[PDB]
């Protein structure tokens, strides 16, 4: 029956870390027998589940995430790991028990001026509740005088934009990251 993983890994365009796109997979069989048959060229990282038992297991749910992040930021997308990107863009819960894949895309995410179309939120009043997608784009304040929209001195549009020129380092390059998170689906 072939559930779509041929678009969660072959789509031309994703969105940013503040706009991490979901894919709700159900009612279907997904041919797992090629995704780990690809000499996991993509960087492949499972928590709790194992690469030898994807065929013989069943689930209520398979939520399939997708976001694009800078190179050194793939440390964040795992339970227990803290810092700015988890605190402000994408929090994982500690008892999340799925598998994470990421791979490099200097192709399709980089001109010589670099794509500035990929955003990231610096700031918010609190750290995230896990798995809370936040499309909030208000003007952040953290001081004694929260004004209306007068920029300067902590009145920022917190969704600043990365640069992704292909002369950057590997820790800065754009990474194409997918979380395979997890009553029908088997193999």
């Amino acid at each position, epitope marked *: 029956n072939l559930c779509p993983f041929d678009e969660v890994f072959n789509a031309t365009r994703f969105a940013s870390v503040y706009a991490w796109n979901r894919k709700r997979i159900s009612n279907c069989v997904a041919d797992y027998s090629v995704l780990y048959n690809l*000499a996991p060229f993509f960087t492949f990282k499972c928590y709790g589940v194992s690469p030898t038992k994807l065929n013989d297991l069943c689930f209520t749910n398979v939520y399939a995430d997708s976001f694009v992040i800078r190179g*050194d930021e793939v440390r964040q997308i795992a339970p227990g790991q803290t810092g700015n990107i988890a605190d402000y863009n994408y929090k994982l819960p500690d008892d999340f028990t799925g598998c994470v894949i990421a791979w490099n895309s200097n192709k399709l995410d980089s001109k010589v001026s670099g794509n500035y179309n990929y955003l990231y939120r610096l700031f918010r009043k609190s750290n995230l509740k896990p798995f809370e997608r936040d499309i909030s784009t208000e003007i952040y304040q953290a001081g004694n005088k929260p004004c209306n929209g007068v920029a300067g001195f902590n009145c920022y549009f917190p969704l600043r934009s990365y640069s992704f020129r292909p002369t950057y380092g590997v*820790g*800065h390059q754009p990474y194409r990251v997918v979380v395979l998170s997890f009553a029908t689906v088997c193999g």
Partner: antibody
Amino acid sequence: QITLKESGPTLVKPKQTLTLTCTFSGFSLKKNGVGVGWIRQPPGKALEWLALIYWDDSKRYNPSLKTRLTITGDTSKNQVVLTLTNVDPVDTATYFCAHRPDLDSDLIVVDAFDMWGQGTMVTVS
Amino acid sequence: LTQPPSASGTPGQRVTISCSGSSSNIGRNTVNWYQHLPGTVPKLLIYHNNHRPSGVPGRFSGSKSGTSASLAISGLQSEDEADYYCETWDDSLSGVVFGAGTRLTV
């Protein structure tokens, strides 16, 4: 289990083209997130870096050497081949093909050479 | 980049290594370190920062205070009579820029 095996001619007259090679083992360059390096060693001076082959033929060279260094990696033949022309006695060195990942299985960027080849004492005379 | 040519130390005291460069590479990207015995192969000693692979003593650590990469030696002994190299990818230079080398005497 990862091993960089390198070979090539070492007894080479000055100023023609030197082609070298390094057969990499223990991994594949069909992997993405992986580079393979080339490193100068002037004995008793320093190291300098030459070039990186990335999996999608992403092309990097040392800004001192643009035209005299062009680089190719044949993943099918499980090797990376180093090409360089018009070769000076200062280019007498030992060259290191080395493995540059970014995996670090708990997923921290490496951006570094973790495994190296032994080296070839390249001589220009 | 910029790296002092050598450093000295008796076998055991806290010995500092320094490295520096511009804001494009070391001031932005992440720093590496290497140990190279004379005549033999070099090897990685610290990658990205402060984190080491299998086979490295945990006493040696780094810091990225802007444009400064600071390898540390504590507990010196005999084996590490070697050239210590800082590299970092450069954004403008589009490549790998090594340090100048630093040999530590025991």
